């Protein structure tokens, strides 16, 4: 199965630079392109340029010339994007993506995206709190319990809970900016009451700016 | 300068229905015209090429459509899945451009806020600062107030909440609200109450909490 592997999120100091990574896997890296996508909530999806690892020939959109380049390793099967010159307004998701052609039925396939923060203030790691079950958090026998992502910069962290094993019923809303230019975000399930005394529940909260990894075990009280 | 506009920023439907999308050309494309769906958080997922046929695994709900430089999206009997923002895509000559996206919206039936509170955690309160997390769960419309009271007092300014995206299996909203205080100003009251009210609730719910249990 073809897969895109994209690096972690960046915090970088305005005006410097950054190298991007996406890693293929599942065919043949030399025989497709890659291409290279901005999006910009602000703005919505912009198309960097291509880039086909055959030859390493590259055709980039002229609005990123000095801002993007495109490389590629064919030897560990990576493409690589050099972001330089960036402005605080250059803040955005870099998505990588290739497509295979074959009896010209198409499918493509794309990186999860690197979140790039581009900001002179310092990174800082959460702090993970549990949202308990009790007898406030229950409906109809269901429980709600969650953790509670504080005090964290830039954006983004990804939340998981028992190593991707619980999805159904997680709500992870959309973090909030506080006043101190910080965020905080809430990840939240809903389980059966019933089985609160036997099963456990562990958020995993990952911050790759500032490397933080915490696993939260969150008890009834 | 080399542009594609969809007209639609948002689109309404109910489940069911069938819906389609305008993406206007400026210049003569022709078949090289691409489609794609987005999800919030997640990678864009081709759809349709050759502004005319579907991508492998693709269902055919979505047939897309056009001549040279007008081109369709049509969704038919839309589903929850569908829920998504939608862009067009011009291939034929660089720089390749995309539209500004249509973003589509399920109509369902009202459903009211199962309504949850958490007091703060003890680790949290070591650190000299009390949370306080009122969550309304799955509801419909996204219109919800979320007023904080404390020792029956309306609070305001130190607190802050965000709302979900449109759930994909069942068209809901969930909105978290976090009350924000110092462990000093937490100990100094008893009752830590959020009152919701909704279109789904005849009277508004109140779920509260004394301090110290
Ligand atoms: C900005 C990226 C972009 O434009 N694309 C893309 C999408 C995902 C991943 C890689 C590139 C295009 C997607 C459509 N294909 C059509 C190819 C075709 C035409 C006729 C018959 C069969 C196949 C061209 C490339």
């Known amino acids: 199965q073809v897969q895109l592997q994209q690096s972690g999120a960046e915090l970088v100091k305005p005006g410097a630079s950054v190298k991007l990574s996406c890693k293929a896997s599942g065919y043949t890296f030399t025989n497709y392109d890659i291409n290279w996508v901005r999006q910009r909530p602000e703005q919505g999806l912009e198309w960097i340029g291509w880039i086909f690892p055959g030859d390493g020939s590259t055709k980039y959109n002229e609005k990123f010339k000095g801002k993007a380049t495109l490389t590629t390793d064919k030897s560990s099967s990576t493409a690589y994007m050099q972001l330089s010159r960036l402005t605080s307004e250059d803040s955005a998701v870099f998505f990588c993506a290739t497509e295979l052609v074959k009896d010209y039925y198409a499918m493509d396939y794309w990186g999860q995206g690197t979140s790039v923060t581009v900001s002179s203030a310092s990174t800082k790691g959460p702090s993970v709190f549990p949202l308990a079950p009790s007898s406030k958090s229950t409906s109809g026998g269901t429980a709600a319990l969650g953790c509670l992502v504080k005090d964290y910069f830039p954006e983004p962290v990804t939340v998981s809970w028992n190593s991707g094993a619980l999805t159904s019923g997680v709500h992870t809303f959309p973090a909030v900016l506080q006043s101190s230019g910080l965020y905080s975000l809430s990840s939240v399930v809903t389980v059966p009451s019933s089985s609160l005394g036997t099963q456990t529940y562990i958020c995993n909260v990952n911050h790759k700016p500032s490397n933080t990894k915490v696993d939260k075990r969150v008890e009834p009280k | 300068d080399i542009v594609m506009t969809q007209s639609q920023k948002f689109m309404s439907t109910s489940v069911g229905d069938r819906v389609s999308v305008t993406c206007k050309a400026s210049?003569?494309?022709?078949?090289?015209v691409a489609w794609y769906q987005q999800k919030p958080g997640q990678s864009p997922k081709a759809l349709i090429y050759?502004?005319?046929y579907r991508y492998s695994g693709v269902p055919d709900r979505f047939t897309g459509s056009g001549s040279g430089t007008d081109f369709t999206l049509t969704i038919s009997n839309v589903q929850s899945e569908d829920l998504a923002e939608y862009f067009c895509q011009q291939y034929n000559s660089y720089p390749y451009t995309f539209g500004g996206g249509t973003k589509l919206e399920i109509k369902r039936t009202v459903a009211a806020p199962s309504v949850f509170i958490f007091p703060p955690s003890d680790e949290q309160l070591k650190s000299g600062t009390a949370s306080v997390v009122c969550l309304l769960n799955n509801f419909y419309p996204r219109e919800a107030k979320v007023q904080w009271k404390v020792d029956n007092a309306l609070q305001s300014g130190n607190s802050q909440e965000s709302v979900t995206e449109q759930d994909s299996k069942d068209s809901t909203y969930s909105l978290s609200s976090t009350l924000t205080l110092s462990k000093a100003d937490y100990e100094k009251h008893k009752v830590y109450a959020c009152e919701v009210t909704h279109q789904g609730l005849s009277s508004p719910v109140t779920k509260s909490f004394n301090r110290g249990e």
């Open positions: 210049q003569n494309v022709g078949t090289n």
């Open positions: 050759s502004a005319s």
